[PDB]
């Protein structure tokens, strides 16, 4: 069909079988880079806006505000542009020129916050703008907004089910907001009734899900796996449906993403390398020898040209 605007075109991303990972082709990857603004977040940027429309919290002339300049910020920016909303994004002044350029290109009103305050300062400024005129501004809250996992239950999950003819046995996904693994797992286990293994992936540098589930002190840390390892348990991570948690280190995530590019011709982002590294570890366990492992690849390589990836 013909999509009425770019937001409706989300999803329907392909599955590709890996040749240099897994055992006898048991690892398949879902390419979320193939989306309106080239990441998995396109789905949630679309659905958070759509749901805010449906529930009346977002109306014509109201303005979106957020403190993300990562994939979610980019996603919200294309959706705002596609649907005629003004959007303000806050971010530390020390964010890259490429990212400022991208966001400005999409028509975002960028508000640069004090470098020394980091993300905390950007978040406080966003909250400040909203509080200044609550009837004018809407903050969509990707870590807690149920529209995030819901779109994965409605689209991402069913796509995996359909494209594997119900043969999927394991889903492996890095956790940022938790929305992907949560929605996918709800779709497959609850809507399609299949008892799969749901595998959350987090950085070994900030293994807060592992520490939490073990009853150990939660000690977040810095890492380079952009998009995952938020340093807390997000509301959109449904721990009830998580079967296993795999930790992967930043160097290995980067090396793996580089291998995806050079050995598979898949232009994967950093966190995609993390998810595949975790999946390859499971794929080479005899217990998973005859099992179909589907891995989410959240983003694409060109978004990382200025990073350690290249």
């Amino acid at each position: 069909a013909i999509y009425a605007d770019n937001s409706y075109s989300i999803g329907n991303t392909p599955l590709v079988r890996l040749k240099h990972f897994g055992h006898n082709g048991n690892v398949v990857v879902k390419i979320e880079g193939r989306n309106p603004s080239y990441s998995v977040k396109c789905r949630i940027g679309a659905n958070m806006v759509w749901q805010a429309e449906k529930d009346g919290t977002l109306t014509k002339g109201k303005e979106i505000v957020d403190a993300t300049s990562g994939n979610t910020g980019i996603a919200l920016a294309y959706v705002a542009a596609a649907r005629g909303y003004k959007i303000t994004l806050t971010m530390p002044e020390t964010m890259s020129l490429e990212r400022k350029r991208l966001l400005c290109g999409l028509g975002v009103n960028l508000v640069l916050t004090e470098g020394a305050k980091g993300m905390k300062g950007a978040i406080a400024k966003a909250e400040e703008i909203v509080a200044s005129d609550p009837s004018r501004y809407v903050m969509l809250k990707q870590f807690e907004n149920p529209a995030n996992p819901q779109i994965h239950r409605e689209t991402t999950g069913p796509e995996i089910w359909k494209d594997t003819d119900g043969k999927v046995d394991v889903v492996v996904a890095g956790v940022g907001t938790g929305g992907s693994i949560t929605g996918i797992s709800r779709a497959i286990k609850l809507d399609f009734g299949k008892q799969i293994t749901s595998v959350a992936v987090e950085p070994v540098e900030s293994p807060v899900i592992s520490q939490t589930l073990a009853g150990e002190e939660v000690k977040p840390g810095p890492h380079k796996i952009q998009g995952i390892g938020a340093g807390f348990i997000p509301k959109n991570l449904d721990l009830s449906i998580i079967d296993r948690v795999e930790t992967v280190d930043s160097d290995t995530a980067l090396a793996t993403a580089r291998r995806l590019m050079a050995e598979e011709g898949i232009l994967a982002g950093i966190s995609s390398g993390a998810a595949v590294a975790a999946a390859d570890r499971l794929a080479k366990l005899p217990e998973f020898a005859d099992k179909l492992i589907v891995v989410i690849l959240p983003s694409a390589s060109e978004r990382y040209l200025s990073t350690a990836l290249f």
């Binding site: 993300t68 990562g70 994939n71 979610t72 993300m119 907001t177 810095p222 998009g227 340093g231």
Partner: peptide, 4 residues
């Protein structure tokens, strides 16, 4: 980091 939470810049997701």
């Amino acid at each position: 980091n939470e810049n997701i």
